[model samples]
Target: TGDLINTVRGPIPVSEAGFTLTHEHICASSAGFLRAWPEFFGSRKALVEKAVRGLRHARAAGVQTIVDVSTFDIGRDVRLLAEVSQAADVHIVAATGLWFDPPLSMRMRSVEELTQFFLREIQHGIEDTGIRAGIIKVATTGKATPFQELVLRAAARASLATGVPVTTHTSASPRGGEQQAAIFESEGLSPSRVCIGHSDDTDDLSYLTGLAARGYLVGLDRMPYSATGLEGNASALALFSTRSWQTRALLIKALIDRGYKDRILVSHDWLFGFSSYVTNIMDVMDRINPDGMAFVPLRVIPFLREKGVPPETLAGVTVANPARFLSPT
Candidate 1:
């Protein structure tokens, strides 16, 4: 039916998208690494198995759907994603678009050509996989560059053509969400259909509220660990900054307090498996939150309840808002 949204496994009704995690990754890898040394990835069979385990854990925790925001520039493999979705029995929505640091091939393309690239993936399918993308993902750095702006505009045009939602990655310090929002508006795309992701990296209430006021869905998606502040470990410190979980919670509460409940989406932004980076997700989860998939259901949600947040508000962020945001208008 028309009410159904596209997932990696095919169409699933909006109602069945229960307890959705708006953003997450099953498997990802660096484009450069894969291009330079494809052999380093080892066996594809082993990689898919690893992803299946995490997806199964998430499904057991009541997450019915997960939006995999891995773009082509980041080595998105829809074929493997399809296999994983089937193995795990969880609906996964794949994305179509480019990342901020696109390759030289994409860099040489014009805005119109780039728009066609994203459209073909969304309307037809990614490569020959026959699995169409459900949403578009675009990104811009702290200081927006000419190339990044070009990618952002093309993403907006593609979103307009397909009538699907557009999500973004912005460097929070210089406040790039406003810049991206402006480009979307120029393309006559509604803010309601656009989500500014990673806005939770900062606790600037006014900046977030301003974006929400314009009808953009604010992504407080980074959870468990936003930043790590381990003294004297320069490498670890460079990899992540120190962030206060309590501050993040307070930001959510403030957003709700100011009547932006319908404009928020909660997610762990957890990276399950990646080839370029060596990671022990189990160790990471143990150090961060042991519940893993239950991090939101067990940790964040309960913490919000303790902070005097209403039941409906929590439900809206976790369920209703994501359904509405991803639903075809």
Candidate 2:
């Protein structure tokens, strides 16, 4: 659509963003980790090196661009992202927005103030890093609170102003995607510019179809991981002990069958680095098998092929759809 799209390294033609992973996190950390132990956080050189290797492997597997949806609240190091993008020879579209669970300091801020915060990052750049954000990321918990609704509205305002696509994180099982779509619609945002992520976690055909019918891009991201149960329950933790790539493929096939190929975006929702909270909460430090980042191109696509998902549909999900959704208006 457009001649160039924004990337960490600068603008690149849409045609160059081959096989883009629509949603991913190269590195992420909790607010507590940085605030409490900034010194103990140690050198980022190794982190950058690890990311570079993962990206290079991704490139070898045919990935050319990745949308890094790490928010500023969650250790969105643009400088390190730029270094990885350059070293890996991959385009990284960094995000501008906030994540879930705001502190009292941020919660008290007005919607207009939050909108300005996101707008400045998008229009100018993130802090003094000089690395501009190419997309907006916002999230909500299982049930939307007033504060969460405000964040959603603020994101919609920024999206309307900038014409940048908006993506989201949802609890998914509670049908949280619907709540997000409702908020976006209330703000008069077109579903085409928004993606309701983590839809693959549920097999509710009615729910998925309803969202697709509304014209929102449904993110069947998180293919490698399954939401067996809620985070706190021991039984739920047991469910995530194994991988679930097959169910994800089947869901994509179902959507394609119903003629919603254009409404779908696929990804791993993969995280390379995690905060102590995530480490303790998920207890996945040693359990993350198949490596979230590489599993897509290495395992899922081949598996999709094995399952008889046509090449044209595969191209649409991986290449064409991302280009259309991400291209500048």
Candidate 3:
């Protein structure tokens, strides 16, 4: 491809964005947890070092680019992303937009006003750092709230204005990815420009097939939730909603069988570090998904390949598709 993809350090030719992971976090604190008990977060130096080490491990495992969807609402630090990208020697495409909930400051803005906020990020930089965001990330739950819907519309319009694509956080209950697509469609966006993330959280092929039929990329992002050592897995952790990672591989083959290889993306959806009331998350994930950001490539890709996906298709999922999606419509 002749395209260049934006990352924290700046644009790199898409050809250099090798073996990419479309969704995962370098670090994140569970919504608002770090604020209440910042002590749970440990120290900032080690956090950045952990992220650098994780990205280096992923690079050694053959990953060169990662679309880190950890927005400011979670743990998106553009400066930290830049530092990690430099230290890890990996490319990081940072995100700008909202997570599930609108912080109080975002609560009152009109859709157009919100769209400008996102546009400024894409067109200029996030928080005056001069590091432009490569994608717009937005989310919705089973029961959509008015503000959540407004954020979706703003993301859609902002995407249209900037040509940066949008990736979503949709609940399995409502298959909210569909609702997300419909809203973007209303804003006159092509379905091909969006990735319907976390589709692997469900066993319903029809729901996924329908989204792919409409030209959306299906994100089989979470795999082998057992990768999380936490036994009583919750939806945020993605284990409760998913079957086995082997099943996730089969799900990818199912979509491929339907002629949608170009419409797929994969990752562990794992985090390098997360802080909650309970514990510093690395202690949990370190023992479990030992592969870190490269878990999908090291673990699931081999399984998917053995299950019948071609080398080129797997290559496309890890490389070309992400570059295409990030290239903007």
Candidate 4:
């Protein structure tokens, strides 16, 4: 009950927002990395401070809403997010649902149980808080964990009942592709209503095409995190692979080639965990130091421009897609 303070329901207008990153975690835990070390999420003050700073940076950069795909545990940060978003003039859309493999002790036991929770969170709003979630979120081990299957089934059922789109965080490893697709398809969920997040770890074309063929959306929004390695110049290079801008737009081009433009979404996947941030800072320093970290969106965009991503396509992935998906029916 006290876990949530405010509830977010449905999608915000594309025009009402800016470059909305599709998969960032505004109020989420840093995977298992944070739980393994309590200091990360516990550094509440630093995170709040960073949240303020990050939102300000986003505003200046013309970015608006951040989807915050951090469901359940780290999710439900509606109250804190609402306060920050309002003060910073940055719109925030929160999520609802539990992640998979959560120590079994903390996991949602069944599809029906999880679906009920989702319906309440999305339609009825969380206890005491008038805040409602706009979308259904879940995760998979990318390995066929039964819990992952349960979460997917719950997501599909909930989406069918509420019309809220479903988003999933798939493992970033090589096998993540097929496994993610299996869960969604197995649950009989449309790829159009489903977004496969954190999908850039592999450059495998066939798998990407396969997911697209199924009408599911693919997310390439990790705008340069240490975990993924291709942040600045490398991101630019990735965006401009074959001398032509079009070829470099791998994720986007992959979707279009598969004829699934509307099904694609993009994001930066930025996180706000105190301990994790500390570690990331250390990693960033080790990797390229401060100067090397500047490329991210700053470079990715220009590359996209040169790559000839129509203003509309860019807007769709950054703004339109998120809004459309956030809408509950």
Candidate 5:
């Protein structure tokens, strides 16, 4: 609303995050993507390189910035993000927070420690590269663990101090988003600043609609890519539709009708890594389109076209809503 807030990427002249791709893992070593993700470790070099490649791809696709939701000691890769942004000429916003799964490093005791760590990172780049983090991330497994509760509380404190947006990760199949939203609301974290991710897997549209009603960003980013063994029979976008395209549009319309239009995001949730479980699942899906399947973002527009999405709806999901959410107010 005032002067454009400067971020780690550069000085913001305008809302240059044109079509913000809300959720994409440039490099994440977190739980769901990491647990069954084959060849995930030691993939730093390749993943970073691919992120740069993906940045260029995103730019060509009309995406101005790609928000990298990698958190430190969990999956946050600030070093790679800094490197890629410098070369790619695209805005890459890095994240700070605690992942839902237990931290790999196991250093912090409570959410207080986590939020302090995030604040320091946001104020003065992690590990001293001067790359400013623009957002905070939190994840919930839908099952209320003690550690998760601590993290929710910590994330609230961080958001209050920084005015930066906070996003959450929840399993699409589980009720993680709902439980997570309850914690945020109870802690006084504005729903607008919190994004409840991966609500596409659940059949309960009412749950996602409720998150929207509560002022949280209902993230249904991972479209078309179903979980392991849940594809083809019912793509996440096609589970409740006569046609895939119709289903996607109706889902968008339904969310909009619920007044969540600004919070909803659409994405492939593509990972740049070679051997993660997501990549493997994408590999299995390649049986249908092979080369095209290998590149998720590359075919998103074509998929929308196949789904008969109108230009307005396509632009809304691909450009407008993302910019609205990712922009610094």
Candidate 6:
């Protein structure tokens, strides 16, 4: 593994990335939606301050790095991420890729075109921000649609063409990571270079272990992974919301029990900021996840401790695994 990593602040030794949240959204919103409801989101100046305060709290609780997996399709702003990283004294890994909703501007692009876009961000810089993305982020809900397949393929080729690792937003219900592995491996992207994100959605040991067995890093990245605290219907864990956190930890313990400690990447895929004006979406996600970046440090870690997991095991999941996964071969 390489020693350096790309952050919004620029490249730094992976050693500086202590206690990283492998996946998170420092901010999330559609420009169209935010434009439609300016008041709901607030000013850019204020959003930076909001992000800074939360990150500082995470720093106080011992978080050194955060990966903002917000693709441009969902309003990713490198300027915002850089500001937050500087103001909070936290290193942030900005992503180069796409997510669920791509307007025609992106959707109409061919796979070759999309691969170049991703490679530009990884190899050069995102737009003119001078901030190269440290990772490539992609998503698929279930069985890949034509466009989703196109996005995955672009991500794979980008990872091959460039050297950055790829992390994904996966729906575990229909087991999207399986398809993602097939496509990525087919593109000759080593499974070791990919983190199959959102794997925590399913408690099935077989499903989780199978991915790990194939050398893919499993993202138990959605902590505070419960029903009431959850913002969307991405998981079936909602049915057992009361014990969801413990169940997630147990799944982690099981993976470690089966000797995949190095392959486990823990995080809280908390979108710390988003403004939805529509009557449709969860209106109070922040309230549901009040801890924000501190959920793992403050809340879930205590629960994991309660589960009798050792400190070194915790550190391996929190610090070592992320550094290892993000490090280029």
Worst 10 residues of 1 by lDDT: 276-285
TM-score for each model: 0.91, 0.90, 0.92, 0.77, 0.78, 0.91
Highest-TM-score candidate: 3
Give the per-residue lDDT digits (tens) of candidate 6, residues 182-219. Answer: 99988899988999998988787888889999999999
Q: Note each model's CA RMSD in angstroms.
A: 2.4, 3.0, 2.5, 6.3, 5.1, 3.1
lDDT of 3 by residue, 100-185 (tens): 64668788888988899899888889887999999998888876688888888998898888889899888875878878888889
lDDT of 2 at 202: 79
lDDT of each: 0.80, 0.81, 0.80, 0.61, 0.63, 0.82
Query: Runs in model 6 with CA error above 4 Å?
Result: 31-38, 227-243, 276-283
- Compose the digit string of candidate 4's lDDT tens values, residues 96-202: 76765355544746778877878888777755677777667787775757777777788888888877778877775755756766666777776778887767655
Q: Residues 110-153, candidate 2, lDDT per residue (tens digit)?
A: 88999998888888888886677888888888888888788899
**lDDT string, candidate 1, 129-211, tens digits:** 87999889888888678887788888888888878899888886679898889888988999999989988888889999999
Q: In model 6, what is the error at residue 59, expressed in angstroms?
A: 0.8
Instruction: Evaluate candidate 3 by giving its C-alpha RMSD to the native, one decimal.
Output: 2.5
**Regarding lDDT, does 3 or 6 come out ahead?**
6
For candidate 6, list the clashing residue pairs, or say none: 221-267
Number of clashing pairs per prediction, in order: 2, 0, 0, 7, 5, 1
Choose the strongest candidate by lDDT. 6
The count of residue-pair clashes in candidate 2 stands at 0
Q: Identify the runs in model 4 with alpha carbons over 4 angstroms from their true place.
A: 1-15, 30-43, 101-105, 226-250, 253-260, 274-297
Candidate 3 backbone collisions, by pair: none
